[PDB]
Design a protein around this ligand. Structure first.
Ligand code: CA
Lengths: 165, 263
């Protein structure tokens, strides 16, 4: 079914089994154990010295464990990247995701990581967004004008940017 | 062998950019072949081998422990960090970080390791003090991959890198245990398949570290040899090309096929 893709990443849902993840992502693209412990790491197309990828964390090592974490780099593309250094500097810790998006642009970000440490409960959910400027996103290369915004329970805890103008 | 040089020049035509090349005898340290041995090229991820060499040096001096756990956070995360991203909740040990940085080119792992040694400035000081007065690291990931033409920040020369790699893998700079550890991480390289490894004959040994950066920069450093033992060091760098990644991988792979063919 090809390598790992953004569409596959999106189709995979929290609560899914290891087998459901593998069948959707394509077993050939995935690995587990070693550096990735109990998680399932799926590679997409080559990019730089590695690849676009997705990592799925599970509640336990059991074969019936459920997906409680979804992470990806270069699989999802921002719909309308308009982030700038000026907008980034206006983002403030304490903002809700809505407030952050109103500041950096509704289509400037993609979900880098989403984790539920208390799954099935959504309390304590941590979420990292990868946001890019007009030309920041690159699927095969490296981000050029981007930022990382992380939240806990929907509230921004911190921010960091690289090469925004 | 001259045929390998014909291939290197072919590469410069195929890529439309300069290629730096060095084949060094591991035992004698003598240059067997070279091309643009003293021109500067961005190290990219190849610097991570020098980084962990500096880490092992501090461990040798008993100022660092392989099992020391580093607890980092969201703020430390940079792009292209598959391993460190996964262990964000529990942290990673110095040992695990070097493995990630060398075998996976994990960028955050490299930055965390840089922090343990004092930063780019201290890595350069480490190198200068071992006899390498050319190689320099100035920035952290991911900025060190900018590859701005004529910018000497974060660069090395093919000859300097080859001699330095030799000192790290066979010199007295590091303890035997540490030399073995460094070469072991390189032998376990998981992300350089399309390069030299793709031309490596059955039974041969190869420990390497590749790198890719902006403006077509691409490169690899390695210790390889027949019958499961490394006997030569190879260093290949290029920057400025507009060719595709595959075309760049191909050119490097062909240079390797040539040097192996005429081993
Ligand atoms: Ca920019």
């Amino acid at each position: 079914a090809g390598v790992m893709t953004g569409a596959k990443f999106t189709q995979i849902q929290f609560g899914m089994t290891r087998q459901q993840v593998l069948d959707i992502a394509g077993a050939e693209n995935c690995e587990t154990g070693g550096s990735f412990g109990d998680s399932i790491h799926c590679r997409g197309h080559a990019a730089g010295d590695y690849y676009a990828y997705a990592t799925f964390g599970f509640t336990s090592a059991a074969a019936d464990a459920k997906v409680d974490s979804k992470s990806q780099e270069a699989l999802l593309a921002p719909s309308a990247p308009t982030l700038t250094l000026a907008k980034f500097n206006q983002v403030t810790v304490g903002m809700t995701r809505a407030q952050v998006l109103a500041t950096v642009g509704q289509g400037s970000c993609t979900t880098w990581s989403e984790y539920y440490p208390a799954y099935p409960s959504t309390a304590g959910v941590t979420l990292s967004l990868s946001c890019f400027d007009v030309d920041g996103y690159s699927s095969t290369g490296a981000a050029r004008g981007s930022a990382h915004l992380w939240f806990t329970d929907g509230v921004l805890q911190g921010k960091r940017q690289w090469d925004l103008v | 062998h001259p045929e390998t040089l014909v291939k290197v020049k072919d590469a410069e035509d195929q890529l439309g950019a300069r290629v730096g090349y060095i084949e060094l005898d591991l035992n004698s340290g003598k240059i067997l072949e070279s091309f643009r041995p003293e021109e500067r090229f961005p190290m990219m991820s190849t610097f991570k081998v020098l980084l962990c060499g500096a880490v092992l040096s501090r461990i040798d001096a008993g100022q660092e422990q392989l099992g020391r756990r580093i607890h980092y956070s969201q703020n430390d995360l940079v792009a292209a960090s598959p391993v460190t991203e996964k262990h964000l909740t529990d942290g990673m040990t110095v040992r695990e970080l070097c493995s990630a940085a060398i075998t996976m080119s994990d960028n955050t792992a490299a930055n965390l390791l840089l922090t343990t040694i004092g930063g780019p400035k201290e890595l350069t000081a480490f190198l200068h003090n071992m006899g390498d007065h050319v190689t320099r690291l100035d920035r952290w990931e991911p900025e060190l991959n900018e590859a701005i033409p004529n910018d000497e920040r974060d660069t090395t020369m093919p000859a300097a890198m080859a001699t330095t790699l030799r000192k790290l893998l066979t010199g007295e700079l590091l303890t035997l245990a540490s030399r073995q550890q460094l070469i072991d991480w390189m032998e376990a390289d998981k992300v350089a398949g399309p390069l030299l490894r793709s031309a490596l004959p059955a039974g041969w040994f190869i420990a390497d570290k590749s790198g890719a950066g902006e403006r077509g920069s691409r490169g690899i450093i390695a210790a390889l040899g027949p019958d499961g033992k490394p006997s030569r060091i190879v260093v290949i760098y290029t920057t400025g090309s507009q060719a595709t990644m595959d075309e760049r991988n191909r050119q490097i792979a062909e240079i390797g096929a040539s040097l192996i063919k005429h081993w």
